[PDB]
Amino acid sequence: YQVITSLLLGTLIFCAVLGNACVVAAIALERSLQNVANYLIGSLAVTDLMVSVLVLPMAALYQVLNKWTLGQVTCDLFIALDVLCCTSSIWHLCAIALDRYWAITDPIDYVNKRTPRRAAALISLTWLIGFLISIPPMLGWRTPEDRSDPDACTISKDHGYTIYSTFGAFYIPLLLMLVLYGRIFRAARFRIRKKNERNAEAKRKMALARERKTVKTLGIIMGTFILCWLPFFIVALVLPFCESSCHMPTLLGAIINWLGYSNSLLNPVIYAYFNKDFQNAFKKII
Amino acid sequence: SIAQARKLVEQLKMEANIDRIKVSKAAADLMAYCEAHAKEDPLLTPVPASENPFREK
Amino acid sequence: DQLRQEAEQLKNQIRDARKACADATLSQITNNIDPVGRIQMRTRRTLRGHLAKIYAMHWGTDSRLLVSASQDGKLIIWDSYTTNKVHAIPLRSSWVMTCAYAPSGNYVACGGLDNICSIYNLKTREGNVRVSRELAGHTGYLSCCRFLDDNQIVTSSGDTTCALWDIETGQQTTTFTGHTGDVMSLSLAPDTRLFVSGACDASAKLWDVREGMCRQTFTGHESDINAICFFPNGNAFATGSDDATCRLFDLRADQELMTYSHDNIICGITSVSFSKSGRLLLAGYDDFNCNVWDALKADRAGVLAGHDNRVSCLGVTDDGMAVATGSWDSFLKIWN
Amino acid sequence: TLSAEDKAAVERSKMIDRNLREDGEKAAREVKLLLLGAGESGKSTIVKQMKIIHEAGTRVKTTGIVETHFTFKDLHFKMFDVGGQRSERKKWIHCFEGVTAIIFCVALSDYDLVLAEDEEMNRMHESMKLFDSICNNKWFTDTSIILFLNKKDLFEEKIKKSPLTICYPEYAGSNTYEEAAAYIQCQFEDLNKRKDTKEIYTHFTCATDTKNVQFVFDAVTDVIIKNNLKDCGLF
Numbered sequence: 001y002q003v004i005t006s007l008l009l010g011t012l013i014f015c016a017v018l019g020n021a022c023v024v025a026a027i028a029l030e031r032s033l034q035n036v037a038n039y040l041i042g043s044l045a046v047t048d049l050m051v052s053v054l055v056l057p058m059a060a061l062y063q064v065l066n067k068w069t070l071g072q073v074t075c076d077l078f079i080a081l082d083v084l085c086c087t088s089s090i091w092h093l094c095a096i097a098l099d100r101y102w103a104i105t106d107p108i109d110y111v112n113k114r115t116p117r118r119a120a121a122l123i124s125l126t127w128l129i130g131f132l133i134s135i136p137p138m139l140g141w142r143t144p145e146d147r148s149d150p151d152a153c154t155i156s157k158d159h160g161y162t163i164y165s166t167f168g169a170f171y172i173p174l175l176l177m178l179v180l181y182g183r184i185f186r187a188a189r190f191r192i193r194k195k196n197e198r199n200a201e202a203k204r205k206m207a208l209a210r211e212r213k214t215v216k217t218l219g220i221i222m223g224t225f226i227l228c229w230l231p232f233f234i235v236a237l238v239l240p241f242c243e244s245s246c247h248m249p250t251l252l253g254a255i256i257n258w259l260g261y262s263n264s265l266l267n268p269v270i271y272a273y274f275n276k277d278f279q280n281a282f283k284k285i286i
Numbered sequence: 287s288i289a290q291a292r293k294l295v296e297q298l299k300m301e302a303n304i305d306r307i308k309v310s311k312a313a314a315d316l317m318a319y320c321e322a323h324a325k326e327d328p329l330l331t332p333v334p335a336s337e338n339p340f341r342e343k
Numbered sequence: 344d345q346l347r348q349e350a351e352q353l354k355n356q357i358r359d360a361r362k363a364c365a366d367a368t369l370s371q372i373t374n375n376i377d378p379v380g381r382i383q384m385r386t387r388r389t390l391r392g393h394l395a396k397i398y399a400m401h402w403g404t405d406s407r408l409l410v411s412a413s414q415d416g417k418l419i420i421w422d423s424y425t426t427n428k429v430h431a432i433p434l435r436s437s438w439v440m441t442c443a444y445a446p447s448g449n450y451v452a453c454g455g456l457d458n459i460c461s462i463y464n465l466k467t468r469e470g471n472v473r474v475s476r477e478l479a480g481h482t483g484y485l486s487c488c489r490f491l492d493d494n495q496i497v498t499s500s501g502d503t504t505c506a507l508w509d510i511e512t513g514q515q516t517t518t519f520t521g522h523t524g525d526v527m528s529l530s531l532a533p534d535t536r537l538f539v540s541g542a543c544d545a546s547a548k549l550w551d552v553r554e555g556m557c558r559q560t561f562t563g564h565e566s567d568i569n570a571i572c573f574f575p576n577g578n579a580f581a582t583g584s585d586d587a588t589c590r591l592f593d594l595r596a597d598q599e600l601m602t603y604s605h606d607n608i609i610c611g612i613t614s615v616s617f618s619k620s621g622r623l624l625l626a627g628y629d630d631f632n633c634n635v636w637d638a639l640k641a642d643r644a645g646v647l648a649g650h651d652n653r654v655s656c657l658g659v660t661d662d663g664m665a666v667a668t669g670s671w672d673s674f675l676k677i678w679n
Numbered sequence: 680t681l682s683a684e685d686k687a688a689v690e691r692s693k694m695i696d697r698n699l700r701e702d703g704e705k706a707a708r709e710v711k712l713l714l715l716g717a718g719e720s721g722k723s724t725i726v727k728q729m730k731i732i733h734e735a736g737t738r739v740k741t742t743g744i745v746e747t748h749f750t751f752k753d754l755h756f757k758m759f760d761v762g763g764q765r766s767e768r769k770k771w772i773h774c775f776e777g778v779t780a781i782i783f784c785v786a787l788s789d790y791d792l793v794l795a796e797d798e799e800m801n802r803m804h805e806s807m808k809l810f811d812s813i814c815n816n817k818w819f820t821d822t823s824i825i826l827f828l829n830k831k832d833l834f835e836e837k838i839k840k841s842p843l844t845i846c847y848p849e850y851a852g853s854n855t856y857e858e859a860a861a862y863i864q865c866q867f868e869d870l871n872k873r874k875d876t877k878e879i880y881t882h883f884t885c886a887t888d889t890k891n892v893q894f895v896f897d898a899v900t901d902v903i904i905k906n907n908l909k910d911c912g913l914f
């Protein structure tokens with residue numbers, strides 16, 4: 001039974017690594033994909049490559065073995081890397097949303113002020129937030145329960161740390177990115193709404209098609225984000241507070257963890273493997 | 287549009303009095319030039335990388 | 344008037360004389376010649392720094408210094424050996440589609456949609472390139488320019504004319520009229536005694552720089568001609584057109600010698616050049632490929648794939664060591 | 680390699696590259712517009728209306744391409760009037776691929792007038808032909824058109840005196856400014872075949888100093904926003 005789990009997790013890890021590396025290489029070698037938006041998408045791909053290469057192998061090993069056989073120090077390292085690289089990925093999603101919001105609503109800023117320095121400042125900010133979430137548990141704010149069982153690598157269950165990390169990693173990023181994409185939806189819908197009868201019919205059909213397309217895009221973005229992370233963070237915020245009478249099934253917990261893990265796989269699929277410029281660059285490469 | 291007609295017809299009548307050699311002679315001359323300078327053409331015959339300025343000093 | 348009655352008679356007489364002189368095709372003469380074989384060229388230097396479509400380039404006589412012009416309004420003098428930018432001249436007009444580098448290397452020419460040919464003095468006392476002269480008088484866009492000396496420059500423009508300018512005084516020493524379409528190409532003879540100009544009327548005319556008269560004409564193409572280049576001998580020249588075909592014409596035979604066309608190419612030629620011996624004819628196309636043809640056998644010897652958008656300019660060094668192709672993707676490539 | 684000359688050449692090339700990068704990023708802030716139209720089609724009128732209080736913010740006169748740099752609401756516009764280019768447009772129109780928009784100026788009052796080349800050729804039909812040619816080039820597939828229907832007062836006087844049926848035999852309607860102007864606008868907007876990918880912004884040029892430049896700015900910002908939305912897949 002463990003062979004099936006091992007091969008499925010290995011397939012997932014290999015697909016994530018291949019996709020992220022392909023996106024990073026396509027951005028690096030191609031001169032066409034050398035703007036701020038693609039800089040942010042490439043940084044997101046690099047962050048997901050760090051997740052797929054650093055935490056996804058040890059997490060898969062922990063899943064298959066059903067125990068941690070790497071030591072306390074390596075357990076702390078794995079937890080720190082997991083939190084840092086998964087918060088950084090979420091905050092790259094919220095940086096991409098912010099850049100899109102600034103491009104849609106501020107054309108003057110997009111023309112006169114948008115520079116790759118802005119992309120660098122956003123990426124550094126996301127990584128700084130990841131560090132600020134991932135580092136405190138090592139340097140205090142930690143309960144001995146993590147070291148209570150040597151055969152487990154559970155994250156710190158402190159209530160203060162639970163609230164702090166869950167809010168600064170998902171919930172604040174969820175609210176902010178929801179607000180930004182709602183504003184983008186309003187702007188896009190306003191722009192879309194903005195023989196003669198045949199021309200009017202064609203214009204109405206084109207407007208309806210554009211509205212359907214924008215709904216589809218803002219669905220495949222937020223829905224994917226929510227389906228992948230909200231199940232994991234609801235549990236991560238509720239369980240530490242509900243110590244008893246709220247037993248977590250192991251299969252459901254594993255499914256909920258790996259849905260969050262698969263966001264590193266699905267991020268290049270949405271932000272890279274859909275837009276036409278990346279497809280043309282990949283066709284040129286292959 | 288008659289003034290330019292005189293110039294055009296003069297140009298044609300001057301262009302028709304030039305001496306022409308047979309196409310065989312021109313083909314032979316081009317072939318002879320290509321064969322005489324074939325050794326001196328780096329693109330035609332690949333040059334060793336030792337004396338190739340754009341590959342190795 | 345009645346002059347059109349004898350104009351067609353003169354055309355028929357010229358065609359009959361050319362047919363009489365045409366006894367053996369150049370392909371028949373070179374049938375027994377063994378093929379050159381596959382020509383494999385690898386990009387040796389990728390000159391980067393242009394930020395817009397590159398429209399023209401010209402090699403230096405030293406065969407290492409290069410000039411390139413692009414739509415971002417910069418004329419870059421490169422050292423092709425070390426990929427070092429020697430000069431970057433900010434042009435007054437960003438719309439430039441031609442550039443020439445003087446044989447002595449002291450001056451460089453540029454021109455384009457603005458009808459002025461700008462001559463920049465490269466080496467001066469302060470070491471800063473400065474606009475030496477601005478040549479006005481053309482009423483159409485300047486499509487090509489070539490230096491005869493440090494003081495004479497021939498320029499072809501889109502008002503269906505060419506002009507030989509004395510840079511010292513800045514006035515047109517001679518004007519060459521006779522084309523009915525925009526002249527797009529301009530090649531100088533090795534001895535700088537004659538030059539061929541190809542225009543949009545699908546005809547190429549041979550002009551004498553001294554007398555300023557159309558020596559002879561060649562009408563073989565179906566579409567407008569974009570590129571032209573003398574054979575190294577100076578007795579023949581190749582023309583590339585939007586008919587997706589090149590044509591080698593002879594000056595002494597006064598007719599078309601050979602045609603270079605393929606079924607898989609339907610895009611016109613933007614640039615034409617010959618190798619040092621003249622055996623290889625390198626033609627850049629709109630499909631971002633440079634076909635190297637056996638100029639004596641009309642066989643595609645090779646393909647210089649590697650450019651992205653469209654090969655707009657192409658040039659072979661005087662020593663023949665390398666060929667540089669500049670394309671719309673803002674990159675120069677040395678192929679060697 | 681370690682020689683002084685090689686190091687000096689390398690640092691000179693690096694300095695040149697830095698200057699090139701700075702100039703390129705400075706030019707990236709410029710909004711390039713391609714101004715087109717017939718000879719006496721109000722092109723000069725539009726140009727002089729724009730360069731009233733915002734402009735340019737021993738050379739030789741060119742009569743080639745005219746470059747007009749102006750600034751509106753912190754946006755810098757480069758506008759290129761190719762009017763002295765009496766040649767084949769097909770040989771240089773690809774130089775302008777990538778412009779934000781094509782400002783096409785057409786005079787409404789030339790529908791009655793005829794070209795000097797031949798009597799049986801309306802100037803309005805020539806303007807429509809050139810609009811059709813430039814709106815459907817392989818280079819301008821995604822480039823939007825800002826249409827400027829100039830000389831509304833002269834057109835109004837002409838339609839009050841002369842009928843519009845001479846320019847449009849198929850036309851049938853009351854001779855008034857509103858209906859005739861709408862008919863001309865729809866006739867020019869019907870020449871657009873790339874309806875999905877490009878939009879035509881029309882404006883009847885008025886005498887107010889800033890309304891035309893405001894319309895150009897609005898159209899350009901709309902084009903930029905819609906291009907960004909397309910980049911995100913929301914358009």
Ligand SMILES: C/C=C\C/C=C\C/C=C/C/C=C/CCCC(=O)O[C@H](COC(=O)CCCCCCCCCCCCC)COP(=O)(O)O[C@H]1[C@H](O)[C@@H](O)[C@H](OP(=O)(O)O)[C@@H](O)[C@H]1O
Pocket residue numbers: 015016018019020022216217220269270271272273274275276909910911912913
């Ligand atoms: C019943 C009513 C309603 C419902 C019915 C119908 C409507 C909806 C149905 C459900 C939709 C499901 C997903 C649809 C995906 C889809 O349509 O994909 C299209 C084709 O993709 C390929 O060809 C690319 C194919 C390869 C993709 C990756 C494959 C590799 C995966 C592993 C990766 C790692 C290894 C490589 C492309 O996407 P698109 O045509 O849908 O439209 C847009 C897309 O939505 C925007 O996101 C994108 O913007 P971006 O955010 O910057 O990316 C836009 O540019 C554009 O692509």
Ligand SMILES: CC(C)CCC[C@@H](C)[C@H]1CC[C@H]2[C@@H]3CC=C4C[C@@H](OC(=O)CCC(=O)O)CC[C@]4(C)[C@H]3CC[C@]12C
Pocket residue numbers: 212215216217219220221223224225227228266
């Ligand atoms: C990769 C894993 C995490 C799964 C993620 C799935 C979601 C991204 C899916 C589930 C339901 C999908 C939506 C279901 C239906 C539609 C309607 C569809 O357009 C219509 O048919 C119009 C409907 C209307 O106008 O009412 C456009 C796609 C969209 C928004 C879909 C977008 C993508 C969604 C949100």
Ligand SMILES: CC(C)CCC[C@@H](C)[C@H]1CC[C@H]2[C@@H]3CC=C4C[C@@H](OC(=O)CCC(=O)O)CC[C@]4(C)[C@H]3CC[C@]12C
Pocket residue numbers: 001004005008009012063250251254255258259262265266
């Ligand atoms: C939206 C697209 C990208 C698909 C994403 C699917 C993944 C989230 C799936 C693929 C394989 C799944 C795994 C396959 C098998 C197992 C073993 C399973 O084993 C248990 O611990 C419970 C059973 C037991 O005790 O043996 C737990 C779930 C898990 C890790 C699964 C977690 C969810 C995974 C990674």
Ligand SMILES: COc1ccc2[nH]cc(CCN3CCCC3)c2c1F
Pocket residue numbers: 082083084086087133155156161162165166169232236256257258260261
């Ligand atoms: C307190 O729980 C928290 C709080 C913030 C967090 N940021 C990133 C993570 C890790 C996300 N990985 C996905 C599946 C397993 C864990 C995290 C967390 F687990």
